[PDB]
C-alpha cells in the first residue's frame, strides 16, 4: 500500500484537464449536455489513474462509472463554485447565475440544490486534499450501491482513500470530537450529492424524452444506463 501522503499526491496528478463549452431552453441544455459529454471522456481517464481501479474486473469498472458519473461531475462543479456565492461555474465561459435557471423547465430546483450543497462545503472550508479524497470515494462506491477477488480489492481501495481522508482531517489539529463530526458531515454531504444526481439524471432523461435536447455518444451511453 501507499502512504496517505502518497495516495493524495496520486489523486492530485490524476486530475482531469479542464474543458471549455464554446440562452433559450434548447441552447442552455445543448451547452450543458455538450459539457457533460466532454467531461465524461476525461472522467474515464481520471478513474484509470486512481490506484487499483484498473485492477478491478472490467465489469466493476463499468458499473462503478455508470453509478457515480453524475455525482463526480457535480462535486467538481461544487468545487469550482465554492468561492463564488450564487454562481455555478460549470466551465470557463459557462458561469451561470442562479436566476438563469429560469431558462429551463425544472432546472432551477436543481441549481438551488447544487448551490446549497456548494454553500455547505464553503462553510466547512473544504480543503484541496479533502476534495481529492471525497471525489475518489464517490467513484469507489462509498455510497455502497450494489454492483470475489474484485469486490475484495474494491473494499481495500475504498478503505485506503477513507484512511487518507481521516489522515487529512487529523492534520487540521482540531479535537478528535470535531474530526469525527467533520467526517460525518462530509459523508452525509456525499449522500446528499447522490440524491441530487438522481434528480439531475431524471431531469436530463426528461429533456431527452421531450426532444428538448439531443443526447449523443458517451453521455447517451451513461444516461441509457440509468
Amino acid at each position: 500500500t501507499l502512504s496517505p501522503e502518497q495516495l493524495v499526491l496520486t489523486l492530485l496528478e490524476a486530475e482531469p484537464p479542464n474543458v471549455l463549452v464554446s440562452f433559450t431552453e434548447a441552447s442552455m441544455m445543448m451547452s450543458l449536455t455538450k459539457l457533460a459529454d466532454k467531461e465524461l471522456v476525461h472522467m474515464i481517464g481520471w478513474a484509470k489513474k486512481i490506484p487499483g481501479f484498473v485492477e478491478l474486473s472490467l465489469l466493476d469498472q463499468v458499473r462503478l462509472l455508470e453509478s457515480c458519473w453524475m455525482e463526480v461531475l457535480m462535486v467538481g462543479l461544487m468545487w469550482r463554485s465554492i468561492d463564488h456565492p450564487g454562481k455555478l461555474i460549470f466551465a470557463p465561459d459557462l458561469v451561470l447565475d442562479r436566476d438563469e435557471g429560469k431558462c429551463v423547465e425544472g432546472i432551477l430546483e436543481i441549481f438551488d440544490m447544487l448551490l446549497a450543497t456548494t454553500s455547505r462545503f464553503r462553510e466547512l472550508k473544504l480543503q484541496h486534499k479533502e476534495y481529492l479524497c471525497v471525489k475518489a470515494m464517490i467513484l469507489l462506491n462509498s455510497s455502497m450501491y450494489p454492483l470475489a477477488e474484485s469486490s475484495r480489492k474494491l473494499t481495500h481501495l475504498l478503505n485506503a482513500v477513507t484512511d487518507a481522508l481521516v489522515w487529512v482531517i487529523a492534520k487540521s489539529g482540531i479535537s478528535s470530537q470535531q474530526q469525527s463530526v467533520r467526517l460525518a458531515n462530509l459523508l452525509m454531504l456525499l449522500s446528499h450529492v447522490r440524491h441530487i444526481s438522481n434528480k439531475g439524471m431524471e431531469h436530463l432523461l426528461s429533456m431527452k424524452c421531450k426532444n428538448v435536447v439531443p443526447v449523443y455518444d458517451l453521455l447517451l451511453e451513461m444516461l441509457n444506463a440509468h
Binding site: 471522456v41 474515464i44 481517464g45 472490467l58 469498472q61 463499468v62 462509472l65 458517451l218 451511453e221 451513461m222
Partner: peptide, 9 residues
C-alpha cells in the same frame, strides 16, 4: 469512443 473502449484504451 465508447465507455468500454475508453476503459480498455
Amino acid at each position: 469512443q465508447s465507455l468500454i473502449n475508453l476503459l480498455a484504451d
